């Protein structure tokens, strides 16, 4: 487990490693916005 003082952020930590995947998906929202130019 995380050290006691940081236990408040445990649910945040359970989610962090997915974040790089969101950058790939974000690239397609950006291209959707400008119409795949």
């Amino acid at each position: 487990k995380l050290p006691e003082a940081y236990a408040i952020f445990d649910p945040l930590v359970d989610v962090l490693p997915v974040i790089p995947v969101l950058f790939l998906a974000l690239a397609f929202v950006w291209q959707a916005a400008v119409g795949f130019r």
């Binding site: 649910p11 945040l12 359970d14 989610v15 997915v18 974040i19 969101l22 950058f23 998906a25 974000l26 929202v29 950006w30 916005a33 400008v34």
Partner: peptide, 27 residues
């Protein structure tokens, strides 16, 4: 919840696109 955090985090990305599109940014 864990789903509260990942919702806020997930909302951030598209929100950047929206702010820039609504302000005619360098998209």
């Amino acid at each position: 919840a864990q789903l509260t955090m990942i919702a806020m985090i997930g909302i951030a990305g598209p929100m950047i696109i929206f702010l820039l599109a609504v302000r005619r940014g360098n998209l």
